[PDB]
Amino acid sequence: GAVTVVSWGGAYTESQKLGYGDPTAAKLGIPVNWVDYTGGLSEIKAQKEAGAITWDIMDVYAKDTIIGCDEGIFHEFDFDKDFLPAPDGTPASQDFFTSMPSKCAVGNILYSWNFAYNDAKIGDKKPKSIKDFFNTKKFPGKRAIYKGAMSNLEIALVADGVKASGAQAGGDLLYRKMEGAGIDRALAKIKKLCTDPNGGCVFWNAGAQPPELLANGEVVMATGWNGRFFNAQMEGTPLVQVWDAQILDYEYFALVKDGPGYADGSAMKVLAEMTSTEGLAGSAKYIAYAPWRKSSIAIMEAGEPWFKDGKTNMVPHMPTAPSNLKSHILMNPDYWADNQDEINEKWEAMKAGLHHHHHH
Ligand SMILES: [Cl-]
Structure with missing residues (x-):
């Protein structure tokens, strides 16, 4: 059978x-x-x-x-x-x-959560950091971000200059900075990106979407899973992955x-x-x-x-290659198992507010 x-x-x-x-x-x-x-x-x-x-x-x-x-x-x-x-x-x-x-x-x-851009479409200036992902003045255009709060809150806080430790005993130190106040800061950061006329957000759900959105020029930068970007690269699509604040999972x-x-x-x-x-x-x-x-x-x-x-x-393409780990965050699964319901209520309220204030 x-x-x-x-x-x-x-x-x-x-x-x-x-x-x-x-x-x-x-x-x-x-x-x-x-x-x-x-x-x-x-x-x-x-x-x-x-x-x-x-x-x-x-x-x-x-x-x-x-x-x-x-x-x-x-x-x-x-x-x-x-x-x-x-x-x-x-x-x-x-x-x-x-x-x-x-x-x-x-x-x-x-695997890693990271982000990529299309080197043939992005222009002369090239994103290099997670701060660049949020920088709509230097890099105007739509972003693709994951549909859920998980991963988004971590990268938002690191882009706000909050320090992650990467892997160590007890998990990443970032999670102790993701209590109520830190969650509110992260939500505000994402809301800011998605409401900016020179930003805006597409929420991806399937892992194939980030490379496709970049290949088609629908967003200027997309978070995603590194293996999906790697596959597109090996198929000849001129994506470049940025590993600053990648989340090792x-x-x-x-x-x-x-x-x-x-x-x-x-x-x-x-x-x-x-x-x-x-x-x-x-x-x-x-x-x-x-x-x-x-x-x-x-x-x-x-x-x-x-x-x-x-x-x-x-080996150089792996989530665990030292060059790719220089500024990584270690995903904490207990944090999300324990808190995803509470966080998702606030996350979905933020997303609903993007629509209710959006003018056609
Ligand atoms: Cl894929």
């Missing part, structure tokens, strides 16, 4: 299907099918409440591993029994480079309880093989996302140039 995996579409799903889904299906004799979504838990909640679950494995935001575990949607793993050791025998828990954020999480890749799979392949073990078998050393390394032949396992990282580095063409080196 087939196992249904849910992911984010475009170049990301392609990297997963080619890197590890199709090989897993062929090896195990369990078909592996892909469904596109745009994140969150609303679809799976609706399916679960209706007693009609058709999804088996979900590729999810870090915060949603926590929420989906706490809501009883996802299966709590027994990590070293359920996931495969590295080839040398290292147990999975020691091969995955850090701890899981929830008992329901298993890592796949690391961790992606996961979760196993849906009571999905079609749950009781019979087929979904778990697929998941264990997709998240193997070889599978996670294989995905990085297609997209600039870093494998979660140390063993997979070592394979990629030793195998450079690792891109599918046998000539493009992948």
Whole structure:
């Protein structure tokens, strides 16, 4: 019987299907099918409440591993029994480079939220910083920003000169600066950008939208996920990514309880093989996302140039390359799991106000 995996579409799903889904299906004799979504838990909640679950494995935001575990949607793993050791025998828990954020999480890749511009359209002056993203005098034009508050509030505060630390024990220091007053400052900063006659905002939802909006000249700068910009670059689109105040984030799979392949073990078998050393390394032949396992990282580095063409080196494009980390923020999934409802109420009220005050 087939196992249904849910992911984010475009170049990301392609990297997963080619890197590890199709090989897993062929090896195990369990078909592996892909469904596109745009994140969150609303679809799976609706399916679960209706007693009609058709999804088996979900590729999810870090915060949603926590929420989906706490809501009883996802299966709590027994990590070293359920996931495969590295080839040398290292147990999975020691091969995955850090701890899981929830008992329901298993890592796949690391990715960055950053921004890009179209070098052929932007003009002679070239954006170089997150402050440039907000600078409508030096860089007039529309921006694309993510539909949700998550990521936007962080970059807004850093563009306001509030300091992030990047990764360190306890998470990024930025989050302690995102209490009520900091949230209000961030909302004001976004509102300012979106209401400025020399700015304005398009809110993107699907990961394919930022590169498309830039390729078509609909915005002058767009936030997005680095792998989606990378894919467009490798297709010949003259985008340039800016990594100042990039947010380093961790992606996961979760196993849906009571999905079609749950009781019979087929979904778990697929998941264990997709998240193997070889599978996670294989995905990085297609997209600039870093494998979660140390063993997979070592394979990629030793195998450079690792891109599918046998000539493009992948390490300099990775979210974790030192050059790309110089001023990064480390995403905090507990912050967003805990506070997204309260924040979203204020975020959506801000967005509704953009319309109500907008003159045709
Ligand atoms: Cl894409």
